[PDB]
Write an enzyme that holds these catalytic residues in place. Structure first.
Site, short mmCIF file in Angstrom:
data_model
loop_
_atom_site.label_atom_id
_atom_site.label_comp_id
_atom_site.label_asym_id
_atom_site.label_seq_id
_atom_site.Cartn_x
_atom_site.Cartn_y
_atom_site.Cartn_z
N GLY A 124 0.60 -1.10 0.14
CA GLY A 124 0.23 0.25 -0.18
C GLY A 124 1.05 1.40 0.03
N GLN A 172 3.16 10.66 0.95
CA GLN A 172 4.11 9.84 1.41
C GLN A 172 5.14 10.34 0.17
OE1 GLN A 172 2.55 5.48 2.25
NE2 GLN A 172 4.54 5.37 2.58
N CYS A 182 6.82 0.41 7.42
CA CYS A 182 6.14 1.78 6.26
C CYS A 182 7.29 1.84 6.01
CB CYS A 182 6.18 3.00 7.18
SG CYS A 182 5.29 4.36 6.60
N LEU A 183 6.78 2.37 4.88
CA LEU A 183 7.77 3.10 3.53
C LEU A 183 8.76 3.88 4.01
CD1 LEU A 183 6.20 1.00 2.07
CD2 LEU A 183 6.37 1.72 0.02
N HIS A 203 -3.82 2.01 7.84
CA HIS A 203 -2.23 2.49 7.40
C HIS A 203 -2.49 3.51 6.75
CE1 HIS A 203 1.79 1.44 7.71
NE2 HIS A 203 2.02 2.43 6.91
N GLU A 204 -3.28 3.93 5.49
CA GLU A 204 -2.58 4.66 4.44
C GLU A 204 -3.06 5.49 4.31
OE1 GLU A 204 -0.08 3.56 3.45
OE2 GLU A 204 0.01 1.68 3.01
N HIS A 245 -1.60 8.13 6.83
CA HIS A 245 -1.00 8.62 6.14
C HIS A 245 -1.44 9.80 5.42
CE1 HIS A 245 2.48 6.74 6.09
NE2 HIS A 245 2.53 5.79 5.53
ZN LIG Z 1 3.61 4.17 5.94
#
Ligand SMILES: [Zn+2]
Length: 168
Positions: A45, A50, A90-91, A132-133, A136
């Protein structure tokens, strides 16, 4: 194109996204770059914010070979129930994982790539990933759920990574 993913401690990760006014072709390009970037990074995702685009667009694809991409534009949470969690990553927080409390089931309303509205009842990894997304998009990170000490730790560590990221 693959977009640069912001890492902590970038302050742009804490910006609130504005809703998409119109799902047109500029939006649809953001979607493909977002998908490309996610696959290149090995995520399941990714949210617009981000990639330094502050608009309510999320892409997700949990599937083995990209036959099940999922696009949520201007998502809204209709209902949630239960609680669970897994050791999330997380990225934007490279190489860090932590168990985070989530709702177990979630019902959302979003628009797809074509600007069409749909509703989705999710559980499992899908439910966790959406939560989670969606976080963000209002400037929340999964480390916000952890103690000051845990966060303080996660923060030292990543800075050290990227220390070496610019590698030179
Ligand atoms: Zn993340």
């Amino acid at each position: 194109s693959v977009l640069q993913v912001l890492h902590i401690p970038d302050e742009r990760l804490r910006k609130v996204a504005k809703p998409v006014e119109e799902v047109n072709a500029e939006i649809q390009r953001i979607v493909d770059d977002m998908f490309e970037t996610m696959y290149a990074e090995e995520g399941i995702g990714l949210a617009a914010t981000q990639v330094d685009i502050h608009q309510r667009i999320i892409v997700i694809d949990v599937s083995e070979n990209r036959d099940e991409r999922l696009v949520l534009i201007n998502p809204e949470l209709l209902e949630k129930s239960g609680e669970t969690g897994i050791e999330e990553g997380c990225l934007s927080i490279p190489e860090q994982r932590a168990l985070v409390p989530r709702a177990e089931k979630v019902k959302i309303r979003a628009l797809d790539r074509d600007g069409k509205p749909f509703e989705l009842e999710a559980d499992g990894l899908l439910a966790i990933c959406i939560q989670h997304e969606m976080d963000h998009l209002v400037g929340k990170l999964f480390m916000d759920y952890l103690s000051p000490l845990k966060q303080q730790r996660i923060r030292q560590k990543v800075e050290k990574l990227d220390r070496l990221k610019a590698r030179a």
